[PDB]
């Protein structure tokens, strides 16, 4: 019984509970957290340097995601 | 030009992110705040779930 974590908006949680039922799954623990969301802009050439320092600064938590 | 990315951090890290952003010629285009529910789930590797999770969310939900 592998464990994972899942981050979701509150209005989606009961839907997650329901899907879990169709895999005999269970909710281990729950928490509530506020985060600041940033939309940033930098040159293509600096993305790696930024992403690297961003990992060092955040002990590997912070993840820079692309906008498609 | 300049490429755009999104980023999620707790409040106490933002200013560091801003400082680093300055060191690489970066700019903040937008900021916002959002509360989320963090779930710790326990399923068998039916891990089907991810596919249904994708349909349910339109690609935006990520199992970690």
């Amino acid at each position, epitope marked *: 019984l592998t464990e994972y974590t899942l981050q979701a908006n509150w209005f989606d949680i009961t839907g997650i509970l329901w899907l879990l039922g169709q895999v005999d799954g269970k909710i281990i623990n729950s*928490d*509530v*957290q*506020a*985060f*600041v969301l940033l939309r940033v802009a930098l040159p293509a050439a600096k993305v790696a340097e930024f992403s690297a320092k961003l990992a060092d600064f*955040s*002990g590997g*938590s912070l993840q820079l995601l692309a906008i498609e | 030009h300049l490429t755009e990315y999104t980023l999620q951090a*707790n*409040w*106490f*890290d*933002i*200013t*560091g992110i*801003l*400082w680093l952003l300055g060191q690489v010629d970066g700019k*903040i285009i937008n*900021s916002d*705040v959002q509360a989320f529910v963090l779930l710790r789930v326990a399923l068998p590797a039916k891990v089907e779930f991810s596919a249904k999770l994708a349909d349910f969310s339109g690609g935006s939900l990520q199992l970690l």
Partner: antibody
Amino acid sequence: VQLVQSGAEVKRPGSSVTVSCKASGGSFSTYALSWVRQAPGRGLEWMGGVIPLLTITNYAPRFQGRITITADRSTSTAYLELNSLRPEDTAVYYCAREGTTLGKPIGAFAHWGQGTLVTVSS
Amino acid sequence: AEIVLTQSPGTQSLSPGERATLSCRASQSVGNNKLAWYQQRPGQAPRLLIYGASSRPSGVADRFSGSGSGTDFTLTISRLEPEDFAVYYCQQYGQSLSTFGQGTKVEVKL
């Protein structure tokens, strides 16, 4: 970097008080400025903060509703609004700014105001 | 959640020159070891001794040393000086909701 707060305040229950925290030295906009209080003979208690550059505020759930934190970038002054005061709210209120190593910010509060005592009494 | 930081002992007595070892236990793991230690003397504002669990800012004596990770942290004062007789606070700032412990008081062994 030095932080200088407004003077003592004596208020009646169910009213409002505004404490100011003026910063000098360093840069004001890019470093996080928090408010912490201490009731008589009790512990330090984080209330919330503001990152001036983005006007992004962060409140402790215990205080949301009764509290508003603002920063004015033109005067380098942060503000704490306490509303609907209650005797419980009597305490010293400190503004605190994170330290640095235009240095890299550390989160932890290296700089503190002298404090402001707000006495709420009938 | 509101991470609860239990500090111990609540109060205790030591003599100048002795080693003081203060504990801060966290109800949950503290993100990226973001834990600070403050010293507060009577009538004074808190002063920062340690941040990031184990980092000392400039102008803080090397007798203060911080360690720990996850949920158990320790502030160690290698040999106490008269100035060191004060209250000490641990603080977590590894999530948007920061919280302080109740404080440990170091009195003069008398």
